[PDB]
Design a protein around this ligand. Structure first.
Ligand code: LBV
Ligand code: LBV
Lengths: 492, 485
């Protein structure tokens, strides 16, 4: 439930209520350009940023109450045809102007009744985009795609760091690829919690696929009037590039020594899959024509992420079928159940990429790899008889079974299947608690306050007693092997 | 099973064996540019188009047996890094050169061999903002039709082609022109459908790998390679991934018979599947500049993503309509006065649920019709036949095939979708569709006029096919109306 903005007597945005900041209506822009609002039908100029006087080269009460028909004689008709009334706010029309001051870049979009116009100053790799397109397409897998992405974006822009975040099923982030300036601390591997990108921001980033912060310490430029004359309501700048960045996030960037930010959304199936995220250590305004190149990549990558990721998962379960069949080969020609499955040539640990494994057959049990102590295994198998059905699954049995909280370091994660119905005979794969070393290692990005160092520690805190989650393809192949090994007791 | 090419004593490519033409190895290029092949490791020039002497500005035995290290001193290292040995043939590296004029080098690797394409260009750009605005337009279009309109309109505005169509391949591999933009005073192709034959499987498969090919002049002479065979292996040079590949002579005739001077087409690919083509025709010869073709390639991929999204969201809203309709039937079904009266009620419109021409309602030992249905005795034989079938549901685009005795009934009922209310076909609903018929989109030999007639011939006794969402909702309604007894 949104708060009111600061300019309508809204509360202070603290770290404990930030998920309710109305980031879409700051009533102000960034000072590297200028903004006008105008009536959708009449073209009468209604609002204006204070600095618009100086960019456009006219006086502050001469622009207000003037027609766009007069101000943009060539563009006003084409502008209008490009944005029919009732079209969505995502739709944008661009063109370049030739004015005294100099060359400007007009970027227009319609929010219902209102037209919003953004003015920036304008005016080099000729085949860098085309070659990058073919490179992304001919990359072998998601990692290699992610490498080409971050590398290409860095070559085009000359940013100090270019990362690619991938959002996990639980909304937490992970830096899956990186390209950076020599002598900067790495973020590759860093994960951050869902909190650090509020749902309001996620949702906004799914609609509009680009936003920047050109100077993390610049003063915002208010609109005048701040409220829309049409409705006496705040102006929705969510789809304007020049929107003032949230003051909360601006601090976060400043605490990393980030002068400038930029990020392109990667969207697959109406879902925010990730972000190309760019940081510079000094203020840096990308020229409008170059930002367009990043936008093309944003969409080329959106298509290609989907294709490479789906083809990776095809080849993943393909490996699990061959492995599964190789288990079932030895299972039919079985000397002793325990001996055949404990055989390291088969590698039942490697099928489910497990740290440990409990094998239970003919009234007794054996382990393989890292497993909890003797008595714990008996209580664990006792607990398995409590559960209904053939399959049991969890990323943290500490939650699902309270008495097994102590067993997390050996076995936080669990995947189990009963061979006969009833848990007398069963396989039980176990995974260790999730632990990752810090992404920078030696260096520091900050320290105890708001920042990435805090964000990493507080991510690991959220994953207390949590294991690496089971791939759905592993849970499916577990349940196929459950049915196969039932057929291997036709020898018993 | 491919034939040998014409230059290795291959047979004549007729209209009856064209599905076996080795279109990937014509051993020749189009005369608006030039081609070199070179060794992947050494960079030694092996083959060369006869016209390459002219374009590059050197003599025909001076270029052959020269290194790319010498010829392209700046590019040869970068070229090589961009195309690692064993990388796929789809991967392309481009750069512009500055020679005695400006040339556009386009390189790709086919295993051991490097293939280099030279076309004339300029030193600028991809825009101005026509591409960017078109991207946002495609994205903010409401459905597949509206997307297809923006596509063909935008491509025509950028290129200035005479016609720009969008083909959509059907499940059976036949084509359909779903959208068009053209010059005022040209005959429309919107609605035209063509059979699977007219784009051979070899060409389909090639168009899935490489997403662009042209024919700059439909009556120009091809330019052979010298030598035609590769010195490495004494094997033909695979030009499948080269833009300058000579177009099949068979298709070139087809275009000429339409009065088409120039052709161009971009592949639309969704999930490793050739979904359709942006297809462009000009009535005079027309060479697209390399920089502009790149703009079409970007759209080809933007459209590939967006086709998928709009089409999946259309189908979401389609079955969404069928749920509301289904529930509105089940509302009247529970408060039923007489089964026949309630379902024959035009306020419910059981015809409109499955978009049917006719409907047979069978309840309490008797039957009634609705809309266009075959004669009285035919309906009795049809319901007799339904008792033969196992299960609750029966489905077909042409019952003439599935039931031989109902061949005569096609004009009223070629297509059939049927469901039994109780188990056993005593009580049942039977939707019926007419035979598929379409008017001409706008002589006797090869051409689109022949292709349209021969498409309709293939769809003899065939109806419009049932959407899977209609067959699914049919089977849900089957279970709902069992509950109304
Ligand atoms: C209490 C609110 C939180 C929050 C506010 C906030 N954050 C954003 C946008 C981003 N926040 C991000 C988080 C990180 N960025 C990083 O680089 C790292 C570590 C390496 C983290 C953890 C990111 C990535 C973004 C996207 C943009 C970018 O990369 O620069 C917003 C939205 C602002 C807007 O759209 O104008 C808001 C309101 N940040 C917090 O830490 C918590 C406190
Ligand atoms: C059995 C041989 C036939 C055949 C050979 C053939 N055709 C192509 C390429 C295309 N053929 C197309 C068919 C049509 N294009 C149209 O515009 C229309 C009518 C509106 C039809 C029916 C199309 C669309 C293409 C794609 C390229 C383009 O649009 O120009 C090839 C492959 C070309 C190459 O790369 O070498 C071949 C071998 N054409 C026939 O009619 C049958 C007899």
């Amino acid at each position: 439930p949104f708060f009111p903005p600061l300019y309508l007597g809204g509360p202070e945005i603290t770290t404990e209520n930030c998920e309710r900041e109305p980031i879409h209506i700051p009533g102000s822009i960034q000072p590297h350009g200028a903004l006008l609002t105008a009536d959708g039908h009449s073209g009468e100029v209604l609002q204006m940023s204070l600095n618009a006087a100086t960019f456009l080269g006219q006086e502050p009460t001469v622009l207000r109450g003037q027609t766009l028909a007069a101000l943009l004689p060539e563009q006003w008709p084409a502008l209008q045809a490009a944005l029919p009334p009732g079209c969505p706010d995502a739709l944008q029309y661009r063109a370049t102007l030739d004015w005294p001051a100099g060359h400007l870049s007009l970027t227009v979009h319609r929010v219902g009744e209102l037209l919003i116009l953004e003015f920036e100053p304008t005016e080099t790799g000729p085949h860098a985009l085309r070659n990058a397109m073919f490179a992304l397409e001919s990359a072998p897998n998601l990692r290699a795609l992610a490498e080409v992405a971050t590398q290409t974006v860095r070559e085009l822009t000359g940013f100090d760091r270019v990362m690619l975040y991938k959002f996990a099923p639980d909304a937490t982030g992970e830096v899956i690829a990186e390209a950076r300036r020599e002598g900067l601390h790495a973020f590759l591997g860093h994960r951050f919690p869902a909190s650090d990108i509020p749902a309001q921001a996620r949702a906004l980033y799914t609609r509009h696929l680009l936003r920047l912060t050109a100077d993390t310490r610049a003063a915002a430029v208010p609109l005048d009037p701040v409220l829309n004359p049409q409705t006496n309501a705040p102006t929705p700048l969510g789809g304007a590039v020049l929107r003032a960045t949230s003051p909360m996030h601006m601090q976060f960037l400043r605490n990393m020594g980030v002068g400038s930010s930029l990020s392109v959304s990667v969207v697959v199936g109406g879902q925010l899959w990730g972000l190309i995220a760019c940081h510079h250590q000094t203020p840096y305004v990308l020229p409008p024509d170059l930002r367009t190149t990043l936008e093309y990549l944003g969409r080329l990558l959106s298509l290609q992420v989907q294709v490479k990721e789906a083809a990776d998962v095809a080849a993943f379960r393909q490996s699990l079928r061959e492995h599964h069949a190789r288990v079932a080969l030895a299972a039919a020609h079985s000397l002793s159940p325990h001996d055949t499955l404990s055989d390291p040539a088969l590698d039942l640990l490697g099928l489910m990429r497990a740290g440990g494994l409990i094998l239970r057959f003919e009234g007794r049990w054996q382990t393989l790899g890292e497993v909890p102590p003797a008595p714990a295994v008996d209580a664990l198998l006792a607990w398995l008889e409590t559960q209904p059905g053939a399959l049991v699954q969890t990323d943290a049995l500490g939650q699902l079974w309270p008495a097994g909280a102590d067993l997390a370091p050996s076995a936080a994660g669990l995947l189990a299947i009963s061979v006969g119905e009833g848990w007398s005979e069963c396989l039980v794969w176990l995974r260790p608690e999730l632990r990752l070393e810090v992404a920078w290692g030696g260096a520091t990005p900050d320290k105890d306050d708001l920042g990435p160092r805090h964000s990493f520690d507080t991510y690991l805190e959220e994953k207390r007693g949590y294991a690496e989650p089971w791939h759905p393809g592993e849970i499916e192949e577990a349940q196929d092997l459950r049915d196969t090994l039932t057929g291997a007791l036709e020898h018993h």
